[PDB]
Amino acid sequence: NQQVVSITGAGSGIGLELVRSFKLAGYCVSALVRNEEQEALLCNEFKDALEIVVGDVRDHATNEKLIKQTIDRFGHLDCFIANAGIWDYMLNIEEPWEKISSSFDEIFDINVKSYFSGISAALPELKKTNGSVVMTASVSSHAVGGGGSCYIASKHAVLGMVKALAYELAPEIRVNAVSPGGTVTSKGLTPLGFAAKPEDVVAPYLLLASRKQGKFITGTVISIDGGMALGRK
Amino acid sequence: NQQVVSITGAGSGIGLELVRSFKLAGYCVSALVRNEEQEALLCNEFKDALEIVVGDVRDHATNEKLIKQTIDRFGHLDCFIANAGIWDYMLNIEEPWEKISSSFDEIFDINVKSYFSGISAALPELKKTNGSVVMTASVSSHAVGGGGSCYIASKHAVLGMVKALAYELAPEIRVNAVSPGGTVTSKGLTPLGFAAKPEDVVAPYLLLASRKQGKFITGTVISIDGGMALGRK
Amino acid sequence: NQQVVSITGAGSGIGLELVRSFKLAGYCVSALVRNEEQEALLCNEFKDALEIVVGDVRDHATNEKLIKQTIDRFGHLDCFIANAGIWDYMLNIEEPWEKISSSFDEIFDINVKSYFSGISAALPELKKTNGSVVMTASVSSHAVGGGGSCYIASKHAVLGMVKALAYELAPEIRVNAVSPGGTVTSKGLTPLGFAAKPEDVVAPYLLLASRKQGKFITGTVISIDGGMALGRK
Amino acid sequence: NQQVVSITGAGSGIGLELVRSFKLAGYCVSALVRNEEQEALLCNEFKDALEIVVGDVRDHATNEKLIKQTIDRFGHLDCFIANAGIWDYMLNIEEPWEKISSSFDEIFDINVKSYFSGISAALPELKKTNGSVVMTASVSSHAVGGGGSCYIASKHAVLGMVKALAYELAPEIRVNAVSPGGTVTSKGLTPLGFAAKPEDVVAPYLLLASRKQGKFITGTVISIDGGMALGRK
Ligand SMILES: NC(=O)c1ccc[n+]([C@@H]2O[C@H](COP(=O)([O-])OP(=O)(O)OC[C@H]3O[C@@H](n4cnc5c(N)ncnc54)[C@H](O)[C@@H]3O)[C@@H](O)[C@H]2O)c1
Ligand SMILES: NC(=O)c1ccc[n+]([C@@H]2O[C@H](COP(=O)([O-])OP(=O)(O)OC[C@H]3O[C@@H](n4cnc5c(N)ncnc54)[C@H](O)[C@@H]3O)[C@@H](O)[C@H]2O)c1
Ligand SMILES: NC(=O)c1ccc[n+]([C@@H]2O[C@H](COP(=O)([O-])OP(=O)(O)OC[C@H]3O[C@@H](n4cnc5c(N)ncnc54)[C@H](O)[C@@H]3O)[C@@H](O)[C@H]2O)c1
Ligand SMILES: NC(=O)c1ccc[n+]([C@@H]2O[C@H](COP(=O)([O-])OP(=O)(O)OC[C@H]3O[C@@H](n4cnc5c(N)ncnc54)[C@H](O)[C@@H]3O)[C@@H](O)[C@H]2O)c1
Ligand SMILES: Oc1cccc(-c2ccccc2)c1O
Ligand SMILES: Oc1cccc(-c2ccccc2)c1O
Ligand SMILES: Oc1cccc(-c2ccccc2)c1O
Ligand SMILES: Oc1cccc(-c2ccccc2)c1O
Structure with missing residues (x-):
């Protein structure tokens, strides 16, 4: 019956919009955000409706923590949305190798x-x-x-x-x-x-x-x- | 405001399902069907809610007729769904050329x-x-x-x-x-x-x-x- | 041992270049050309080294004739190069349907x-x-x-x-x-x-x-x- | 005039075959091999005809060394062939994360x-x-x-x-x-x-x-x- 989604990159941009849209569509939602400042935005907007985790997606235990807190609060997970990402600012192949x-x-x-x-x-x-x-x-x-x-x-x-x-x-x-x-x-x-x-x-x-x-x-x-x-x- | 869709291949299969789904989603719908038997199915199901045209999609004037009847009944067209199609039954390249x-x-x-x-x-x-x-x-x-x-x-x-x-x-x-x-x-x-x-x-x-x-x-x-x-x- | 290629569109452009390159690479070559004028070009260039056929590639018997003359002159066929083609001159979808x-x-x-x-x-x-x-x-x-x-x-x-x-x-x-x-x-x-x-x-x-x-x-x-x-x- | 190619992964497989084929085609060739055993194979086969470098392609200075030795011996570089690679043995996504x-x-x-x-x-x-x-x-x-x-x-x-x-x-x-x-x-x-x-x-x-x-x-x-x-x- 009740659907549960977990979203990374959820503090801004498309991720944040996925949080809203999936909440409006009736899902229970967990969210991974990068830092305190993004965490404050979602607490204020959704109060305690979400399950929120602050950390670096490059750290496995942060990802396991997100899953673990989702299950404990909502009991199961139906969809994982891997969305965190970063741009390269058009970095040229002619640049110094170490860069x-x-x-x-x-x-x-x-x-x-x-x-x-x-x-x-x-x-x-x-x-x-x-x-x-x-x-x-x-x-x-x-x-x-x-x-x-x-x-x-x-x-x-x-x-x-x-x-x-x-x-x-x-x-x-x-x-x-x-x-x-x-x-x-x-x-x-x-x-x-x-x-x-x-x-x-x-x-x-x-x-x-x-x-x-x-x-x-x-x-x-x-x-x-x-x-x-x-x-x- | 009010959206209007026109669908070919609408007498059966996916086309018929598109007629239902788009009607349920609030669209005004026109439909091209192949023959009398398919026309009777949609008249009975949707009574006079649709604009229906019987003909061969291979004939341009049948396609223009579909558009023309859509505009005259609903006043405008927002989406055309070209869906009529046929299968080749796995016809082998080794078969007689005329076939x-x-x-x-x-x-x-x-x-x-x-x-x-x-x-x-x-x-x-x-x-x-x-x-x-x-x-x-x-x-x-x-x-x-x-x-x-x-x-x-x-x-x-x-x-x-x-x-x-x-x-x-x-x-x-x-x-x-x-x-x-x-x-x-x-x-x-x-x-x-x-x-x-x-x-x-x-x-x-x-x-x-x-x-x-x-x-x-x-x-x-x-x-x-x-x-x-x-x-x- | 001896390789045999048959090329359509061979009177000009890439086709003509394929005739030269494949002849230089040692192949026996048959060629379909569109008209008399292209036929004269290849007769003069290759004298009787090639097997040449004039006709419309849209006609099956012209294609069978090309194959048949290849086999009779060279005994077998190792590669067919379908190359004849035509451009559409950027014809716009807004043009009259009959066009x-x-x-x-x-x-x-x-x-x-x-x-x-x-x-x-x-x-x-x-x-x-x-x-x-x-x-x-x-x-x-x-x-x-x-x-x-x-x-x-x-x-x-x-x-x-x-x-x-x-x-x-x-x-x-x-x-x-x-x-x-x-x-x-x-x-x-x-x-x-x-x-x-x-x-x-x-x-x-x-x-x-x-x-x-x-x-x-x-x-x-x-x-x-x-x-x-x-x-x- | 004279062409020069540099090939990584050249101690075995396709890389080794590229060394032979490019040498037979007239190129001057440099080669990066992984270890001493592969180096001995190419020294024995090509004697001193090649420029050879042993090292890990994951190390930038090994790659710069390959280029540098190519230029000093042959004077210029016309083609780089990046070929070193490794397989994953069908590793399943269900395996332990650390693996x-x-x-x-x-x-x-x-x-x-x-x-x-x-x-x-x-x-x-x-x-x-x-x-x-x-x-x-x-x-x-x-x-x-x-x-x-x-x-x-x-x-x-x-x-x-x-x-x-x-x-x-x-x-x-x-x-x-x-x-x-x-x-x-x-x-x-x-x-x-x-x-x-x-x-x-x-x-x-x-x-x-x-x-x-x-x-x-x-x-x-x-x-x-x-x-x-x-x-x-
Ligand atoms: N918006 C576009 O034009 C566009 C185009 C192509 C691809 N994308 C992709 O969409 C996805 C989301 O992009 P967005 O447009 O919302 O960009 P964004 O500028 O909002 O940043 C992406 C999100 O991921 C977070 N993030 C970055 N590094 C993180 C880390 N190490 N740990 C945890 N979180 C981290 C960021 O804090 C942010 O919340 C990305 O994967 C991006 O590559 C976007
Ligand atoms: N269902 C699948 O597995 C599948 C797979 C690949 C592609 N498709 C494609 O989906 C589209 C619709 O397919 P469907 O699954 O509903 O098949 P279908 O068996 O229901 O037949 C397609 C529809 O097009 C109509 N049609 C055929 N010729 C016509 C003509 N000359 N004039 C007017 N109408 C004509 C048919 O009467 C029918 O209503 C087709 O283009 C098909 O190629 C379907
Ligand atoms: N040259 C390019 O920029 C380019 C780009 C994309 C595709 N192509 C394709 O390459 C192929 C050969 O093209 P080309 O560049 O040498 O062009 P081209 O102008 O030389 O003409 C193509 C050849 O096919 C012949 N031909 C046309 N209709 C024929 C017919 N009905 N029966 C028999 N022969 C017929 C022509 O007489 C000609 O010999 C074509 O299929 C073309 O679509 C070329
Ligand atoms: N043969 C196939 O079926 C196949 C299929 C797909 C892709 N490939 C690709 O072809 C390329 C060459 O493959 P191969 O078939 O000759 O395989 P291979 O088993 O011969 O090994 C690849 C070569 O790269 C070397 N190499 C591996 N790690 C290295 C390192 N860290 N530093 C320097 N050298 C290193 C190896 O010693 C070896 O010489 C690879 O990139 C491979 O991914 C091969
Ligand atoms: O593709 C992208 C993915 C993520 C971020 C950006 C971006 C961020 C800040 C300013 C401009 C772009 C982006 O372009
Ligand atoms: O791809 C397809 C497209 C249209 C019809 C069929 C089909 C029709 C009757 C019986 C079986 C298949 C199909 O397979
Ligand atoms: O893609 C193409 C394929 C065949 C011919 C042309 C062409 C013919 C004459 C003049 C210009 C182009 C072309 O562009
Ligand atoms: O795709 C591939 C790329 C490189 C090596 C292998 C391989 C190596 C040893 C034994 C079997 C395969 C491979 O499959």
Whole structure:
């Protein structure tokens, strides 16, 4: 009956919008935020309705803590949304290697390894409900232009994870992703001529997590990028 | 305010389910059906709520008639759903050429040319509302196995249409598709271990047509195929 | 021992270059040309070294005639290169339907149906040698920008053919394609900053037809487009 | 005039075959090998014809040393072939996190970060010749089945690198990849019904490095996998 979602990167941007949208859609929600300042925002907005955890998604025990607190408060987990991520600011391959190397470590630890980490930590509990995973990918999973080679590689790697994990975990667990692009969060033409606000981007996540609307969907990546995967207009 | 959708292939299968789902979601709906028998089914079910047209989607004037009757009854058109299609029954390339040739003509006239035809006929009116197109593609747009070379080629061609038309018609008109697979309609393992009923497949169409949920989506193809694009399990 | 290739679209452009390159590489070559004027060019250049056929690739018996004359002169067929094709001159979807319809018929009859036709006609003989097919696709098989929706759809359909036929005809017959773009033949930026001459584009065909270099390749599409599939620079 | 290639992973498998094939094709060749035992094999085979370096590709200075010794012996560098890589032995996402984490670090440091590292180290010198990069990707860059989620993700990330770097470094430097699959090196059906020996796989690298055959190719990935990207037969 009652559905439960856990969301990383939930202190801002799309993550924060997923918290609102999933709460409005009736879910019980847990959230991982980065710091105290983001924690205060959600406490004030949702009072004690949520289960909140502050920590670094690069730390496995923080991910296990998120799962553990979700189960203890709501009793089970139906969907894990791995969404925390970071940009590379168009870092050029001609830069000093040590600068590339340090950035690579951070991009790949947050945008890829941490997804493995949260999925590992969520897996036992999703197996008990035949739940699902949704990963935030990127237009840069499909097309060039919206990042440097480290960012694009990291997001291509997410696509790999989606296909590989969807295949290995079927039939019990669905694994899908969403590929947003050109939406302001904290320059973006896009063929549809505008940049999306984070709220304008959340519906694909709801579909992929929904047990009714999404029961037949796995391995799938839904672009919501104003046409940017097609090229400059 | 009031939204209006026009659906081909609406007498059966996914098309019929789109008629129900879009009516339940509040749309005014027009429908193209193939024959008298399908027309009687929808008259009995929806009484006079719909605008219905009987004819061959391979005939342009039938497509223009559908648009014309939609406008006259509801005043405008917000979304065209090109969905009529036919299968090739795994026709082998080793068969007599005249057999391949006759089948090719039919598959490509219905699965591709007719989509061009309906979009041409719907275009003036979608331009007046900044509406959208949703096309029914197929798992065979992405992967082999689910048809002969004629079917697969025809569905790859639909993908081409989606990308090409999404790019040309932006920013006013969004153009997207849905790629169902392994759902019974009138053998299908699929990694999720079951065949979907047509009702289980409709939510992606609603998202892509929705002006709120879908305003930032074009060029996109949403697989809903139980994982079949990933391969046999 | 002695290898034999048959090439359509061989009177000009890439086709003509394939005739030269494959002759220089030691193949016996048959060629389908469109008209008398192209026939005179190859007779003068190659004297009687080739087997030449004038006709419309849209006519099955012309394709069977090409195969039949190849076998009778050289005794067997090792590779069929389906290359004849036509452009759509960026025809807009907003044009009068009858104009779109007439153009669609021609683009799809030449760029798709004729490939089915030549493959059907070549198939018996390739099965006797475990030979191969190479199809000319296009950058427009992968990306928008280089044609109207009819051209792009037709070339996406070729990709479908490659995957579908490669899978059905394995293990005996390999089926591959080449996707050229931005090369002058009878405007093209391309990230590599120049337009290729037809001779600069032929090496991928030689690899895919070569029994030594290509024995492990099927289902494959080789872009040779100066980076154009990646987007405008 | 005289062409110079530098190859990592050159002590075995495809790398070793690339050393032979490129030497037979007239190139001057440098090679990075892992250990003393591989170094002895190439010294005995090629005597002092090559420039050889022993070290870990995960160490930047080893990569710079390879470049530096290439230039000092041959004077310039025309092509860098990043080929060193490692498999994940189908490691399951259900395994203990610390086991996944340790393996992830190694797969991604060798299969991705080291490619960034060698390209950074080769870049100054390729810019002086308008040279090229070829990366070894994998069937797992495109399809599931041939590895665990870490391997597949790492190889999807390589594809990202190819597209991203091809776009950023055009027009001076071409960047391409090769995606082998199902070839024994130190179980593999493949639709073509056999596993390739490493020698059977080298021709695509020669084409992508060749200044004549490959001058118009960048952003491209050439599968040579016996059809495995298409699915089980
Ligand atoms: N908005 C776009 O245009 C766009 C485009 C492509 C991809 N994305 C992806 O969407 C996802 C969410 O992006 P957003 O737009 O909401 O960006 P954002 O600027 O709001 O930041 C992402 C969120 O992840 C958090 N985060 C970063 N590092 C963390 C860490 N080590 N531990 C815990 N949390 C951490 C951040 O504090 C923040 O809450 C990302 O994966 C991003 O790569 C966004
Ligand atoms: N159900 C699946 O497994 C699956 C898989 C891949 C693709 N598809 C695609 O979904 C779309 C709808 O399929 P469905 O599953 O509901 O199949 P269906 O068996 O119900 O038949 C398709 C509909 O299109 C109609 N139609 C056929 N030819 C027509 C014509 N010339 N003029 C007017 N109408 C015509 C049919 O009468 C029917 O109503 C098709 O394009 C199909 O290619 C379905
Ligand atoms: N050159 C490029 O930039 C480019 C880009 C994308 C795709 N292509 C494709 O390459 C292939 C060959 O193209 P090209 O560049 O050499 O062009 P081209 O201008 O030389 O013409 C193609 C060849 O096919 C022949 N042909 C056309 N219709 C025919 C028919 N009905 N019957 C028999 N022959 C017919 C033509 O006479 C000509 O010889 C085509 O399929 C084309 O779609 C080329
Ligand atoms: N052969 C296949 O079926 C297949 C399939 C997919 C991908 N690949 C890829 O091809 C590339 C080469 O593979 P192979 O088939 O020749 O395999 P291989 O078993 O011969 O080993 C790869 C080579 O890279 C070397 N290497 C590993 N770690 C190294 C390190 N840290 N520092 C320096 N060298 C190191 C190894 O010593 C070896 O020489 C790899 O990237 C692999 O991922 C191969
Ligand atoms: O793709 C992206 C992912 C995450 C953050 C940003 C961003 C953050 C601050 C300012 C501008 C962009 C971004 O672009
Ligand atoms: O992909 C498909 C599209 C349309 C119809 C069928 C079908 C129709 C009757 C019986 C079985 C299948 C199908 O498979
Ligand atoms: O993609 C293409 C395929 C075939 C011909 C042309 C062409 C022919 C004449 C003049 C210009 C272009 C083309 O662009
Ligand atoms: O994809 C791959 C890449 C590199 C090595 C192997 C391998 C090595 C030893 C034994 C078996 C396989 C492999 O499969």
